[PDB]
Design a protein around this motif. Sequence first.
Motif, mmCIF file in Angstrom:
data_model
loop_
_atom_site.group_PDB
_atom_site.id
_atom_site.type_symbol
_atom_site.label_atom_id
_atom_site.label_comp_id
_atom_site.label_asym_id
_atom_site.label_seq_id
_atom_site.Cartn_x
_atom_site.Cartn_y
_atom_site.Cartn_z
ATOM 1 N N UNK A 37 0.836 -1.187 0.000
ATOM 2 C CA UNK A 37 0.000 0.000 0.000
ATOM 3 C C UNK A 37 0.880 1.250 0.000
ATOM 4 N N UNK A 38 0.343 2.384 -0.460
ATOM 5 C CA UNK A 38 1.197 3.566 -0.658
ATOM 6 C C UNK A 38 2.024 3.957 0.557
ATOM 7 N N UNK A 39 1.430 3.987 1.750
ATOM 8 C CA UNK A 39 2.105 4.485 2.941
ATOM 9 C C UNK A 39 2.731 3.380 3.785
ATOM 10 N N UNK A 40 2.650 2.122 3.357
ATOM 11 C CA UNK A 40 3.022 0.994 4.206
ATOM 12 C C UNK A 40 4.295 0.368 3.648
ATOM 13 N N UNK A 41 5.418 0.605 4.332
ATOM 14 C CA UNK A 41 6.728 0.224 3.808
ATOM 15 C C UNK A 41 7.096 -1.228 4.095
ATOM 16 N N UNK A 42 6.877 -1.698 5.321
ATOM 17 C CA UNK A 42 7.420 -2.968 5.788
ATOM 18 C C UNK A 42 6.335 -4.032 5.834
ATOM 19 N N UNK A 43 6.629 -5.192 5.241
ATOM 20 C CA UNK A 43 5.756 -6.338 5.291
ATOM 21 C C UNK A 43 6.271 -7.428 6.214
ATOM 22 N N UNK A 44 5.455 -8.472 6.354
ATOM 23 C CA UNK A 44 5.855 -9.656 7.103
ATOM 24 C C UNK A 44 5.084 -10.858 6.580
ATOM 25 N N UNK A 45 5.686 -12.031 6.750
ATOM 26 C CA UNK A 45 5.138 -13.283 6.254
ATOM 27 C C UNK A 45 4.291 -13.955 7.335
ATOM 28 N N UNK A 46 3.871 -15.196 7.067
ATOM 29 C CA UNK A 46 3.075 -15.954 8.024
ATOM 30 C C UNK A 46 3.838 -16.197 9.318
ATOM 31 N N UNK A 47 5.167 -16.106 9.283
ATOM 32 C CA UNK A 47 6.002 -16.322 10.455
ATOM 33 C C UNK A 47 6.265 -15.040 11.237
ATOM 34 N N UNK A 48 5.647 -13.926 10.842
ATOM 35 C CA UNK A 48 5.845 -12.631 11.489
ATOM 36 C C UNK A 48 7.274 -12.122 11.316
ATOM 37 N N UNK A 49 7.924 -12.516 10.225
ATOM 38 C CA UNK A 49 9.253 -12.036 9.872
ATOM 39 C C UNK A 49 9.170 -11.333 8.526
ATOM 40 N N UNK A 50 9.848 -10.192 8.408
ATOM 41 C CA UNK A 50 9.760 -9.407 7.183
ATOM 42 C C UNK A 50 10.282 -10.212 6.000
ATOM 43 N N UNK A 51 9.436 -10.420 4.990
ATOM 44 C CA UNK A 51 9.852 -11.078 3.758
ATOM 45 C C UNK A 51 10.152 -10.105 2.626
ATOM 46 N N UNK A 52 9.890 -8.813 2.812
ATOM 47 C CA UNK A 52 10.147 -7.833 1.768
ATOM 48 C C UNK A 52 10.207 -6.450 2.395
ATOM 49 N N UNK A 53 10.818 -5.516 1.670
ATOM 50 C CA UNK A 53 10.903 -4.124 2.091
ATOM 51 C C UNK A 53 10.862 -3.242 0.851
ATOM 52 N N UNK A 54 10.170 -2.111 0.961
ATOM 53 C CA UNK A 54 10.113 -1.132 -0.113
ATOM 54 C C UNK A 54 11.329 -0.221 -0.021
ATOM 55 N N UNK A 55 11.880 0.147 -1.172
ATOM 56 C CA UNK A 55 13.066 0.988 -1.202
ATOM 57 C C UNK A 55 12.787 2.296 -0.461
ATOM 58 N N UNK A 56 13.516 2.598 0.620
ATOM 59 C CA UNK A 56 13.241 3.831 1.372
ATOM 60 C C UNK A 56 13.365 5.096 0.535
ATOM 61 N N UNK A 57 14.101 5.030 -0.574
ATOM 62 C CA UNK A 57 14.310 6.188 -1.439
ATOM 63 C C UNK A 57 13.418 6.106 -2.673
ATOM 64 N N UNK A 58 13.731 5.230 -3.624
ATOM 65 C CA UNK A 58 12.900 5.073 -4.805
ATOM 66 C C UNK A 58 11.653 4.258 -4.468
ATOM 67 N N UNK A 59 10.803 4.059 -5.472
ATOM 68 C CA UNK A 59 9.603 3.242 -5.309
ATOM 69 C C UNK A 59 9.849 1.893 -5.973
#
Lengths: 48, 28
Positions: free
Chosen positions: A26-48
């Motif tokens: 989502x536009x404002x939501x940078x950090x995700x997490x998987x079923x294990x509650x561990x981040x599986x991806x991250x959005x580039x803090x600078x570019x999109x």
Amino acid sequence: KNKCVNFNFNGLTGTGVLTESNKKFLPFQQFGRDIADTTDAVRDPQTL
Amino acid sequence: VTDLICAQKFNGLTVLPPLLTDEMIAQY
């Protein structure tokens, strides 16, 4: 990209292979997490 | 009879493939 590295993105840090995928956060939501509650991806803090 | 292992395999839990594949089992 496509290499084993220790990355620090905004307030998160970790080790792993970074590969750009087709996932879309989502536009404002940078950090995700998987079923294990561990981040599986991250959005580039600078570019999109 | 039914990624899930993708997340768990990364946590350090490795799923070992069976020595006997399902293809050869069907030939039994």
